[PDB]
Design a protein around this ligand. Structure first.
Ligand SMILES: [Ca+2]
Ligand SMILES: [Ca+2]
Ligand SMILES: [Ca+2]
Length: 317
């Protein structure tokens, strides 16, 4: 409701911007500040217009030049900024599943937080780019109840609109309560059904009703009654249903708090949310953690990487 930090620029001149970028890179060394000064002050759509103008008017490829001139985390953020929105998510999902390891955290983050419509575009573009089914790769790289949550999210079939069937709210809450009170293991299918099928308004009512009948928040019961990546997936859905900006604020906190930094998560969240809800993220971060997002980034990063992340954040002195 406050929205993004990065906006479309006024006075946008793609041919000038292309020349600025060329001048920043031509010759020994690089003017990284000049690169930030353009790209962090244009939206993703405008950055694509710059790519086109750079090819047409400089006779070179902008992404290729950026990759040649930049390195490390700064390169990763800049090239991420230059990637069309859908394709960036596609590429992050592919990276999460490629080869031996599986980045379950990334799969959860994207699939829980994106809308069905966004996930349709992701699914189709993944197929077109790689000639692999996103669903098939999920089913190859994850298993059991966690897999079922990711498959459901990947299919985009959740109920929509805000219809309030209060009897079904009451039955859902009661079902979730009884699913936790079973003697020999939680009925995890009830959690899957309710949290993957029902509309948002419905779920917000279920959360409040569950608290009324159990005296526990649904997150408390998820934590005590489930485990592993399935637990994490359920919690992400709950958090996203309550407030997506708060979900992202927590991801940013966790990426930076204590020793070192989860740069892959910090980068993906800052790049993906800068134009959507970064101002809301900042507000929720401050409420949750009693410190500014800006100050966290400034204390955890350095160099040109810090500079660009602080423009994406906005703020603060
Ligand atoms: Ca150079
Ligand atoms: Ca894998
Ligand atoms: Ca740290």
């Amino acid at each position: 409701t406050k929205g993004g930090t990065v906006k479309a620029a006024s006075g946008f001149n793609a041919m000038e911007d292309a020349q600025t970028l060329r001048k920043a890179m031509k010759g020994l060394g690089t003017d990284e500040d000049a690169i930030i000064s353009v790209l962090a002050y244009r939206n993703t759509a405008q950055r694509q217009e710059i790519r086109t103008a750079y090819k047409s008017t400089i006779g070179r490829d902008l992404i290729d030049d950026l990759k040649s001139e930049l390195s490390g985390n700064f390169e990763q953020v800049i090239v991420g900024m230059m990637t069309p929105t859908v394709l960036y998510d596609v590429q992050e999902l592919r990276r999460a599943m490629k080869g031996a390891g599986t980045d379950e955290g990334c799969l959860i983050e994207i699939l829980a937080s994106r809308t069905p419509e966004e996930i349709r575009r992701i699914s189709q573009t993944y197929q077109q780019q790689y000639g692999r089914s996103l669903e098939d790769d999920i089913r190859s790289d994850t298993s059991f109840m966690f897999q079922r949550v990711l498959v459901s999210l990947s299919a985009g079939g959740r109920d929509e609109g805000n219809y309030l069937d209060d009897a079904l709210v009451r039955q859902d809450a009661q079902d979730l309560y009884e699913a936790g009170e079973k003697k020999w293991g939680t009925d995890e299918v009830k959690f899957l059904t309710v949290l993957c099928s029902r509309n948002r308004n419905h779920l917000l009512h279920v959360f409040d009703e569950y608290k009324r009948i159990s005296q526990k928040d649904i997150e408390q019961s998820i934590k005590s009654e489930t485990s592993g990546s399935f637990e994490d997936a359920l919690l992400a859905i709950v958090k996203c249903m309550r407030n997506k900006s708060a979900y992202f604020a927590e991801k940013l906190y966790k990426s930076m708090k204590g020793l070192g930094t989860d740069d892959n998560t910090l980068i993906r969240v800052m790049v993906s949310r800068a134009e959507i809800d970064m101002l809301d993220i900042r507000a929720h971060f401050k409420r949750l953690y009693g410190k500014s997002l800006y100050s966290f980034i400034k204390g955890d990063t350095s160099g040109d990487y810090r500079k660009v992340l602080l423009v994406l954040c906005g703020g603060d002195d």
